[PDB]
C-alpha cells in the first residue's frame, strides 16, 4: 500500500542528518521517529517473519537506525570523539545455517588504509514465529593494527554490539525490517547488496 510508501519515506526524511542515531539525539526528534516507526509497524505488512526468513529476511542489511548510542565515558575510552569513525553496520543473515553475522567497519582519517572489520558471528534459533533467539558464536578483529589499538577494551566493544538474546521481528518488507530485542532496543534496517558489504 502506498501509505506504507509515504510512511517509509517520511521516515527517510526524518532520520537524515543524524548519523543513524548513534551519537546522541534530541528528545523530540527521537519521540517523533519512534512514533513514526510505531505507525509503520502498526500498519503491518506481511506478518509471520519466520515463514519469510528465506524469502524476505535472507541476505544482507545495513543499519539505518537503532537505539544504540555511544556516549561520554565509553566514547572517550574507545577514542571516537576523534581519530576513529564507524563506517556502518551490516548484519548479513544466514538462514541457511541458522546463523548470522554482524560486521562493523572502522576507519580513520586516512591514518592508514585501516578500514578494519570487527566480525561477530552468532547462531540463532527459530523459537517462535516472530521472536527468534540468537546467541554468540565467535568474534574477530582485522587487521592486526586495529586489534593492537583496541586490545584493552575489546571486551567492552563486544558488550556494546553483542548480537544475542531474543529478537522479535516486524515489518518484514521486501526492502527493510524492524526488530525489537531482549534489551528492548529497536533496530530498523534496510536491504542492501552483499557486494558492497
Amino acid at each position: 500500500e502506498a501509505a506504507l510508501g509515504d510512511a517509509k519515506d517520511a521516515l527517510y526524511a526524518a532520520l537524515e542528518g543524524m548519523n543513524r542515531g548513534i551519537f546522541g539525539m534530541t528528545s523530540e526528534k527521537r519521540s517523533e521517529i519512534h512514533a513514526l516507526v510505531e505507525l509503520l509497524e502498526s500498519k503491518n505488512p506481511t506478518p509471520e517473519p519466520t515463514d519469510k526468513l528465506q524469502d524476505k529476511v535472507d541476505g544482507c542489511w545495513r543499519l539505518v537506525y537503532s537505539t544504540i548510542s555511544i556516549l561520554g565515558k565509553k566514547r572517550t575510552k574507545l577514542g571516537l570523539r576523534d581519530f576513529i569513525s564507524l563506517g556502518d553496520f551490516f548484519q548479513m543473515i544466514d538462514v541457511k545455517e541458522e546463523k548470522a553475522v554482524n560486521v562493523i567497519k572502522f576507519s580513520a582519517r586516512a591514518l592508514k588504509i585501516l578500514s578494519g572489520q570487527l566480525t561477530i558471528e552468532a547462531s540463532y534459533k527459530i523459537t517462535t514465529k516472530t521472536k527468534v533467539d540468537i546467541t554468540l558464536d565467535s568474534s574477530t578483529i582485522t587487521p592486526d593494527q586495529l586489534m593492537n589499538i583496541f586490545q584493552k577494551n575489546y571486551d567492552m566493544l563486544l558488550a556494546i554490539f553483542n548480537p544475542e538474546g531474543w529478537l522479535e521481528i516486524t515489518y518484514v518488507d521486501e526492502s527493510l525490517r524492524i526488530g525489537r530485542d531482549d534489551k528492548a532496543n529497536i533496530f530498523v534496517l534496510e536491504r542492501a547488496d552483499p557486494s558492497e558489504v
Binding site: L71, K73, T76
Partner: protein, 325 residues
C-alpha cells in the same frame, strides 16, 4: 587590594627583567622583535616572577646577604620563560580562540611563528638552567616540565568522566599550575642558602598558593558574565572538563549525572546544569576549600621573621581570595 599596589615593592627588578627578556628573544629579527614586544607586554604579569623576587629578598634578609645574586635573576627569567611558552603552546593546542580577546599570538602571527617561539623559549630556559650549576634545582625544574607534559597527555583521556574524586582534581591542578610556583619558591630559598626546614615550609607555601589560584579561576569561570571574556560561562564544562563546583554538586543530584552523561544532547541542558550547580551550593563549598588552602599558606608563612615582604605575600593571598569578590 590591587595588583599594582602589590607589585610596586619590586618594580625595578621587574623592569630590568623585562628589558633582559626583550633583548634576549628575537635579537635583531624583525618579526620576532614585534612578537617579543607583544608577548611579554610591559611590567605586570608578575605573579610568578614577583613571587620569586619577594621570597628571594625575604630569605636573603634572614640569611644576612646584602643583595641578590645573579643566579636569582636567572631563576626568575627561567620561570617566566617556561610559563610563557606553556601558555603559547596551550593556545595552539585545543585550537580555541580570543583568550580574553587578546587575539592569541597564534592568531596574530600564525602557527609557524608560535611553534618556533615556543621552542626557542624552551631551549633558552634549558641553557640557563644548565648554566645555574646546581644539580638539585635542575632536577626540580625538570620534574616540573615532565609533569606538565604528562598532565597534558592525561587530560584527554579523562574527558566527561562522570565519577572522579577531589584528590584527582587536586593532583591534576597540581600538575597544571602549583608545581611551577612551588619549585620556584623552593629554588629561590636554596639559592639564598637557608636551612632545610624553611625550604620545606616555602615549598608548602607555593603549593597551597597555586592550588588556591587554580580553584578561584575555576570558580570565576562559572559566575563571570560572557562579555568579561569570550565564550559564556561553563565553557570547559561543555568541553567535558569537570571543575570543583561540578564535583561538589555531583554528590547530590543524579539528574546532573544524566545530563552530563547525555553529553549535553538535550537543548538548554547547559543553562539547566548551571542553575543546578548554583542551587546545589557547590560554589560555597569551593569557596571554603579555597579558604582552607589560603589559611594553610598563611600559617606556613609564620616561619619568616617580621618584614614588609611578608605583608606583601599575605596581601597576595588576600587579593587572590578577594578576586571572587
Amino acid at each position: 587590594m590591587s595588583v599594582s599596589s602589590l607589585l610596586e615593592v619590586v618594580a625595578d627588578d621587574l623592569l630590568k627583567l623585562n628589558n633582559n627578556l626583550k633583548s634576549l628573544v628575537g635579537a635583531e629579527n624583525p618579526v620576532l622583535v614585534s612578537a617579543a614586544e607583544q608577548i611579554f607586554g610591559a611590567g605586570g604579569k608578575r605573579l610568578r616572577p614577583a613571587l620569586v623576587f619577594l621570597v628571594s629578598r625575604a630569605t636573603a634578609e634572614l640569611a644576612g646577604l646584602l643583595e641578590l645574586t645573579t643566579e636569582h635573576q636567572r631563576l626568575a627569567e627561567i620561570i617566566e620563560m617556561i610559563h610563557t611558552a606553556s601558555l603559547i603552546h596551550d593556545d595552539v593546542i585545543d585550537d580555541s580562540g580570543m583568550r580574553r580577546g587578546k587575539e592569541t599570538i597564534h592568531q596574530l602571527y600564525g602557527t609557524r611563528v608560535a611553534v618556533l617561539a615556543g621552542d626557542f623559549m624552551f631551549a633558552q630556559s634549558s641553557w640557563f638552567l644548565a648554566n645555574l650549576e646546581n644539580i638539585e634545582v635542575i632536577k626540580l625544574i625538570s620534574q616540573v616540565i615532565k609533569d606538565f607534559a604528562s598532565g597534558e597527555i592525561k587530560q584527554a583521556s579523562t574527558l566527561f568522566d562522570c565519577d572522579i574524586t577531589l584528590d584527582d582534581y587536586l593532583l591534576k591542578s597540581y600538575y597544571k599550575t602549583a608545581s611551577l610556583i612551588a619549585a620556584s619558591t623552593r629554588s629561590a630559598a636554596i639559592f639564598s642558602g637557608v636551612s632545610t626546614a624553611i625550604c620545606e615550609q616555602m615549598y608548602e607555601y607555593g603549593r597551597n598558593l597555586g592550588l588556591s589560584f587554580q580553584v578561584v579561576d575555576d570558580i570565576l569561570d562559572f559566575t563571570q558574565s560572557a562579555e568579561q571574556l569570550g565564550k559564556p560561562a561553563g565553557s570547559d564544562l561543555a568541553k567535558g572538563n569537570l571543575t570543583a563546583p561540578v564535583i561538589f554538586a555531583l554528590q547530590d543530584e543524579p539528574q546532573l549525572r544524566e545530563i552530563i552523561d547525555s553529553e549535553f544532547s538535550e537543548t538548554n541542558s547547559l543553562a539547566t546544569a548551571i542553575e543546578l550547580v548554583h542551587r546545589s551550593g557547590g560554589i560555597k563549598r569551593a569557596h571554603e576549600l579555597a579558604r582552607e588552602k589560603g589559611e594553610i599558606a598563611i600559617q606556613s608563612l609564620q616561619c619568616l621573621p617580621r618584614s614588609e615582604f611578608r605583608s606583601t605575600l599575605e596581601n597576595m593571598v588576600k587579593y587572590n581570595l578577594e578576586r571572587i569578590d
